[PDB]
Amino acid sequence: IEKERDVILREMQENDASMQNVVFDYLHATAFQGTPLAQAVEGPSENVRRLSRTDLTDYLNRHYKAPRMVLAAAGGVEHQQLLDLAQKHLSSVSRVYEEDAVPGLTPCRFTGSEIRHRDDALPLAHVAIAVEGPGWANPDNVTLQVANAIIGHYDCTYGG
């Protein structure tokens, strides 16, 4: 835990040195502020340093439940053999909760806002502008992906 904690500190420094991830994390924070969707996946360094083994066991016993797990196989695999192996191994996952401490999905507000991290010594500027999306279950995802295909993408090494 201590060794990987040092690894996470070094990797957070590396990802801070990465230009695009900083901007996407800033966009997530300034779009879903005040909600659990604002916080980055790696988490703050204070929580990384102060996190203990008992928090990891609590997360394992709270979030690694049976019905929120999908065992997916693709390729030269038989579903009957996969089901038999899943019955052999992943049968006992303890879907029940510790004291009926069942969590719940809460909607996260979208807000119109900006964050500007000005540091003029850097060579290039990264800017991301977004709006509120439709969600997974909304049938407008195909239309909005088509519109994203209309707008397209470009890199400076494109041969077009």
Next chain:
Amino acid sequence: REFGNLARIRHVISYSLSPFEQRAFPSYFSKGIPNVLRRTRERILRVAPPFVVVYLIYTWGNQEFEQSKRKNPAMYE
């Protein structure tokens, strides 16, 4: 001169909200009257006393002009 470059700024993060998502008059009175009263306290002693002297010698000049208009009884015979 042009908006792209004017000065060198490093490590400064600015947070801003949408005008259609925040109020236009947030605590206009409760946080507004103490602010203007604090500004008045800060800049009341350097402004008011000269105008007090204006008013004082205004009244003094009017009084002296009206007294010069008024005659005197130095003419009894």
